[PDB]
Subunit: 71 residues, 7 copies
């Protein structure tokens, strides 16, 4: 298929997003686009196992993503 | 289905926190934005892992610098 | 053979992907695209040539990739 | 219920501004112009590293790429 | 007198591909495209004189390449 | 598109260029182009304010530039 | 008065290429393109001032160039 297809197959389901530099985000994938900018709902920022803050929602720049996976 | 830029829009005039590469944060009112994700914040504060470094009437942030944007309160 | 061509010749077969900084993955190449983003089913993250974890599947930003090679 | 990023930049032509470059340094000068890329031109400006003035220049042309943020300095 | 041309005049011949970071690859140039992505057959990964891997073939993102040269 | 104009107003006049990282150049601006690649004549590589080496001319990649500023002195 | 024109005025002549990261290249400029990719003939990879390697020729990714100079 197309990687963007699998992304769409994950809408409304939980996911794990990895970022350059080390940090991770966990939550519900709401939307996305050709830049791979992502939108998460009810998410936690994670650094080396420990949470570093919760957020009602976030908009991440695709240019910061390494990979995304379902949980 | 809901898209990134859309959510930004749904947040114009309200307060937001902008993360940046390196670690410096910003808190202010999202005034505007363009397609390359540049941002415009009014009455914002630069945040150094905790404390406040500077306060500005307004600020024009390069999109290429942002890591994420989150609605505050 | 075109770079993108050789990749296609591997759809469904196992592969190893190496990202900038070390992180290596091992799984089935499900799909790809222009930019070179990749989708991998049933795969394991491997920085140190061993096994560090597993993930039903993953979508990788082509920007992150260094190389892709068929896992004999 | 207005703006755009490039607009606010225009709304500062001829006024003093603070420019934050990637790395750490900064520039303080009169915003003379800009463009799509977001390249900037500054007049009678100073380079500043962690507080100290490192050099004064008649004017400077800053590659958009280098910029982190621009703000009007009141 | 055309970087990509030189690359072409080496298909099927042995080459040295230097990546960013320090690592290297020695193998047979198979394919290539506009971006400068490469395809190598029967290659070995090299880090400061030592072989860290042998592979049937590899697809290298142009983005990673520092340089490519022929080896008699 | 005014920055590119300023560069033009300096063609043949001396200038100082700074590249991402730290290296600085001083010489006569000869040419330039959309991308911001530059051509300098009789230039010198610099640190701490003065001379460190010389080159009849150099072609810098716009991708490497941080800033250019006209400088007789 | 155009960068790419100066390169061309150096075809078949010795040049020095400085790449990000530190290392340099010395050799005869053979070719180049819009991406400023370069081709060198009979070149040496110099590091910290020591000849670190000789090659019959190299194709240097433009993206890795800092600057090119004659003589
Ligand atoms: O003179 C130029 C040419 C390009 N760019 C911008 O720099 C980036 C490429 O490094 C692109 O966003 C491009 O728009 C500039 O800032 N100035
Ligand atoms: O010869 C070139 C080609 C591109 N670029 C710049 O590098 C950016 C991305 O590498 C391009 O958008 C362009 O602004 C250069 O500096 N020199
Ligand atoms: O074969 C290629 C393809 C792209 N680039 C340039 O390298 C940069 C990659 O970020 C971009 O400016 C692009 O124009 C090259 O140097 N060579």
């Amino acid at each position: 298929p197309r990687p963007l297809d699998v992304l769409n197959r994950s809408l409304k389901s939980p996911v794990i997003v990895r970022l350059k530099g080390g940090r991770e985000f966990r939550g519900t994938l709401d939307g996305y686009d050709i830049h791979m900018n992502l939108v998460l709902l009810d998410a936690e920022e994670i650094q080396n196992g420990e949470v570093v803050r919760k957020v009602g929602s976030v908009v991440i720049r695709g240019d910061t993503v390494v990979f995304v996976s379902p949980a």
